[PDB]
Design a protein around this nucleic acid. Structure first.
Ligand SMILES: [Mg+2]
Ligand SMILES: [Mg+2]
Ligand SMILES: [Mg+2]
Ligand SMILES: [Mg+2]
Ligand SMILES: [Zn+2]
Ligand SMILES: [Zn+2]
Lengths: 97, 38, 45, 80, 176, 162, 131, 222
RNA sequence: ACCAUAGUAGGCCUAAAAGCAGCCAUCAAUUGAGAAAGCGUUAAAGCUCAACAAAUUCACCAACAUAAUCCCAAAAACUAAU
């Protein structure tokens, strides 16, 4: 949460995390959602739309970030760790935007 | 840098790293806390 | 003892057998029983 | 910049509840209009660790407070 | 834009410090704020203090939210005392009955804190009891017929003695 | 083992985590009741810096060591293996466990000096100009003191300082 | 290693288990949600809106809740209790109002729950609200 | 989630009047007119006095021998008084005021001519003796923290010990001495006069058992 | 890493003393947070600690420059040694 807060998320439009809580490999995605929907991340940019899609039969937890560079970062996290996902997202944000 | 026989952290931001065979208190917030083990 | 598996609407195709057996019990009775049943439900609820 | 009262008016009613301009002070309703459990609260020394039983949340709240106090006392000397 | 808390009087809403400069720095006019406060609290007894929250929006627009007065003021008014005790616990300033405590709790239940935290009146009564303990006001179960005045007389003589001792100490320090 | 792959197409990035098959432990350990890998395979006080077949079992493909909470070693065995890996890397063993830099591999430098049983980092030691006399002699450390408990068939203790 | 030195269960964990059992036995509607760390004023406003409908929320440690869950008949709720958890506790289950008041915040996901010993997912709660 | 442990409560201990350390005189009220020989046996060997706690729970233990003079006494007094809480702690001395005179030549630096002139007074301290003893309603961590400075500034090596720590180190020493593996020990060899080692040993080595060498005490010598 | 809201700016002194020049109390709301253990402000604000919620490899002290004609055997970590 602190890493995203110290990044200036002002240049992010929409972040949607779609997962199934009843699966066994959605823990990393849930932790990513909690880290990206924190109070500091909310206050560092207000126009960002954070969506949490819950399914039961999807069985494929994924995250989508659409931002105003006309850019789409999609990460289908089934074995990715939460820390690695956060680092990759932060690197892409500080690279483009 | 101050060359000392005993290194102690003078704040919470001091970090101890071993370089060139010696021990170092490096500090970024307060550069005056730079200490080098003799 | 345990609970169900929480099926969703994405692939909803199986229903609990309780409703089917209730329908079968309803259908396996005569019009006199139907009249008594509906009058009893009217009186109670 | 308000004013208090010296005579038995204090014993006959309170002087804080009335906030609006009109002096519609509330009367002292007896126990017939006040709850019984109100008069059954610890108004003296706070409950102690040896007084509280170990099967209530109050005991563990007090233990947590004492642990925080102990940590503060032992960390009074902040080396860094 | 930000969150502003202010202890303001019911009708003595002056456009001066320490409240006028803060709102001027924020950007909203202070005359409008004073007028709105006076018209909103014109039915409240002038002189009592009360906390209020000021919300400032871009284009320099302000809104006012006013809560219940301070428990310190409530308990001091209930006990009939003008100022609290210095040495808390070792000396007692006044006596407040559990009945007065319950009345204060009932009248203050309609504040933002205890409204957002939907709790029974027992919690509010306990909070008022703790505030009285901090104030140095003892909370007797049920004792007020004339002993309240009997204690008031001795409290007045003790306050006079304390004032004399403070004057003597100040004179000794000045001559030292 | 897990790998992260990145795909770029039309200013869109997709990263995927792919799991490939990894080798498992051998079926028959000589001492199955040991709680530690080395200490149950009976390699305690048995390996050295030159036993790369054991030292390379758990090191990252770029030469870094693996965490103890993942490997399962006891603390002393983890420290011994870390020191052995350092000594092997300095000696020149494990030549394929280095990062690939085509831009830096072209500017060749002075030929590497052959060495082994090197305790300190080569760039952190100062030459001993004085060297002392017999009563106060400055000795050169060789090997590591962590491996002083290894089995000695000849019976002579290892000369860690010479 | 030597045999296990069984750690005595203290009053804190005993009372937590007692409260969890009372919650799981008394009330009927037990929903599970992900606890998102936000401002305390937002938390207080959420409790305010929930207590408008007289349905509460609780937080219990996982170290205590997981053994109770696997020992009880709710072993199918294990995947719902990995991260930060919120237990919405309700008598006279009213999922429609809960969905209506939680729709305002888009990023609070309904992990699932049970209504009268019937495990239902977010789709199940949608169905109950539609009913 | 972590368990809640009870905290130690101190109610039986009572803080006495004047918990600060008392001022000590550099010279005794009656000075010693007669110059005495510098017996170093008051430093050599283990201590027999002030080796056990009397009223406090923490102490400064001396692991070696030496002389304490008014500078050391003033240092200890000032440091402990300024870093100790009078409302919850109390401290007491365990060494007497400087009484043993020390002489310096002064007039004339050539060898001979007689004894020197009394310059200052010292308090001889042996290894294993307590110097300052503290107690009260406090925990050992803070007392150890601000007593390690005094222990370091003392001439002889010293530690900030407690009753539990002193008992632990004594029991560890006893365990080491009982489970020592090699059959050959300094005490056994010295008492049996094996190899004629009494020729190079000392008559006090039979009692010191090789753990004390002059004014230095080595606690790891069994 | 992890977030830190409440009666309340606790009561006195003070130009101001809002957890923090100081003295006395040290209660109480919440499932969980000391009238506050360190930075910071004239005073506020703000940054941390302990508290809950999440996981939890191991973690108490121990390291310390130098001289004068030119450094000073060379070298060696495993073939069995009471
Ligand atoms: Mg010393
Ligand atoms: Mg509480
Ligand atoms: Mg914390
Ligand atoms: Mg120099
Ligand atoms: Zn620093
Ligand atoms: Zn092992």
């Amino acid at each position: 949460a602190a890493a995203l807060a110290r990044l200036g998320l002002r240049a992010v439009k929409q972040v949607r995390v779609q997962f199934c809580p009843f699966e066994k490999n959605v823990e990393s995605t849930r932790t990513f959602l909690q880290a990206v929907s924190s109070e500091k991340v909310r206050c560092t940019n207000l126009n960002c739309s954070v969506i949490a899609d819950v399914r039961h039969d999807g069985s494929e937890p994924c995250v989508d970030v659409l931002f105003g560079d006309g850019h789409r970062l999609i990460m289908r996290g089934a074995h990715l760790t939460a820390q690695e996902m956060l680092t990759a997202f932060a690197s892409h944000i500080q690279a483009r935007g | 840098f101050k060359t000392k026989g005993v290194l102690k952290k003078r704040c919470r931001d001091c970090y101890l790293v071993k370089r060139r065979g010696r021990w170092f208190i490096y500090c970024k917030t307060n550069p005056k806390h730079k200490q080098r083990q003799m | 003892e345990a609970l169900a598996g929480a099926p969703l609407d994405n692939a909803p195709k199986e229903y609990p057998p309780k409703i089917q057996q209730l329908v079968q019990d309803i259908a396996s009775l005569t019009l006199l029983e139907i009249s008594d049943l509906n009058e009893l439900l009217k009186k109670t609820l | 910049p308000e004013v208090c009262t010296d005579p038995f008016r204090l014993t006959t009613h309170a002087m804080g509840v009335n906030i609006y301009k009109e002096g519609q002070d509330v009367v002292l309703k007896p126990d017939s209009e006040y709850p019984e459990w109100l008069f059954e609260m610890n108004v003296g020394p706070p409950k102690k660790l040896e007084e509280l039983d170990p099967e209530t949340r109050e005991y563990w709240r007090l233990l947590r407070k004492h642990n925080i106090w102990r940590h503060n006392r032992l960390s009074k000397n902040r080396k860094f | 834009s930000g969150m502003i808390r202010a202890i303001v009087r019911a009708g003595q809403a002056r456009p001066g410090p320490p409240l006028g400069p803060i709102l001027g720095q924020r950007g909203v006019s202070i005359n409008q704020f004073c007028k709105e406060f006076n018209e909103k609290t014109k039915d409240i007894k002038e002189g009592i203090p009360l906390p209020t929250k000021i919300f400032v929006k871009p284009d320099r627009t302000f809104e006012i939210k006013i809560g219940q007065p301070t428990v310190s003021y409530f308990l001091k008014a209930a006990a009939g005392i003008e100022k609290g005790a210095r040495h808390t616990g070792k000396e007692v300033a006044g006596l407040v009955t559990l009945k007065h405590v319950y009345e204060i709790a009932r009248v203050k239940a309609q504040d933002d804190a205890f409204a957002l935290q939907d709790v029974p009146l027992s919690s509010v009564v306990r909070s008022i009891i703790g505030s009285a303990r901090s104030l140095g006001i003892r909370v007797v179960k049920d004792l007020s017929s004339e002993e309240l005045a009997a204690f008031q007389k001795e409290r007045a003589l003790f306050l006079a003695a304390q004032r004399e001792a403070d004057l003597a100490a100040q004179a000794e320090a000045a001559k030292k | 083992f897990r790998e992260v792959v990145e795909i770029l197409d039309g200013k869109t990035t997709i990263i995927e985590g792919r799991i490939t098959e990894t080798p498992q432990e051998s079926p028959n350990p000589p001492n199955p009741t040991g709680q530690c890998p080395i200490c149950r395979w009976n390699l305690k006080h048995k390996y050295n810096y030159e036993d790369v077949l054991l030292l390379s079992q758990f090191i990252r493909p770029h030469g870094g060591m693996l965490p103890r909470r993942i490997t399962g070693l006891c603390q002393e065995e983890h420290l011994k293996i870390e020191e052995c890996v350092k000594m092997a890397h300095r000696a020149g063993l494990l030549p394929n466990h280095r990062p690939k830099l085509p831009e830096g591999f072209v500017p060749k430098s002075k030929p590497r000096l052959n060495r082994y049983l090197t305790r300190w980092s080569p760039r952190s030691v100062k030459p001993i100009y004085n060297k002392g006399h017999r009563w106060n002699k400055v000795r050169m450390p060789v090997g590591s003191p962590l491996l002083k408990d290894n089995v000695s068939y000849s019976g002579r203790p290892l000369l860690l300082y010479h | 290693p030597p045999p296990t030195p069984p750690q005595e269960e203290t009053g804190l964990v005993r009372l937590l288990r007692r409260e969890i059992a009372a919650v799981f036995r008394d009330n009927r509607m037990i929903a599970v949600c992900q606890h998102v760390a936000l401002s305390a004023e937002d938390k207080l406003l959420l409790r305010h809106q929930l207590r408008k409908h007289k349905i509460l929320m609780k937080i219990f440690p996982n170290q205590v809740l997981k053994p109770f869950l696997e020992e009880s008949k709710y072993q199918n709720l294990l995947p719902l209790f990995v991260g930060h958890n919120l237990l919405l506790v309700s008598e006279e289950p009213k999922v429609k109002e809960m969905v209506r008041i939680l729709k305002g915040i888009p990023f609070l996901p309904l992990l699932g729950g049970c209504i009268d010993d019937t495990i239902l997912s977010r789709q199940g709660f949608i169905n109950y609200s539609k009913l | 989630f972590k368990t809640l442990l009870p905290v130690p409560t101190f109610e039986d201990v009572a803080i006495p009047e004047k918990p600060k350390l008392r001022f000590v005189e550099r010279v005794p009220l009656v000075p010693k007119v007669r110059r005495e020989r510098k017996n170093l046996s008051d430093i050599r060997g283990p201590s027999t006095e002030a080796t056990e706690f009397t009223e406090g729970r923490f102490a400064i233990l001396a692991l070696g021998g030496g002389y304490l003079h008014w500078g050391h006494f003033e240092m200890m007094r000032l440091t402990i008084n300024r870093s100790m809480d009078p409302k919850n702690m109390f401290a007491l001395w365990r060494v007497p005021a400087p009484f043993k005179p020390i002489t310096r030549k002064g007039m004339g630096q050539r060898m001979g001519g007689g004894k020197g002139a009394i310059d200052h007074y010292v308090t001889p301290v042996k290894a294993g003796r307590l110097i300052v003893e503290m107690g009260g309603r406090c925990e050992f961590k803070e007392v150890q923290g601000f007593l390690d400075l005094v222990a370091h500034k003392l001439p002889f090596p010293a530690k900030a010990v407690s009753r539990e720590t002193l008992e632990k180190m004594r029991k560890d020493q006893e365990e080491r001495e009982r489970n020592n593996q090699n059959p050959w020990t300094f005490e056994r060899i010295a008492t049996a006069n094996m190899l004629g080692i009494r020729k190079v040993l000392s008559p006090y080595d039979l009692t010191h058992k090789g753990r004390y060498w002059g004014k230095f005490y080595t606690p790891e010598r069994v």
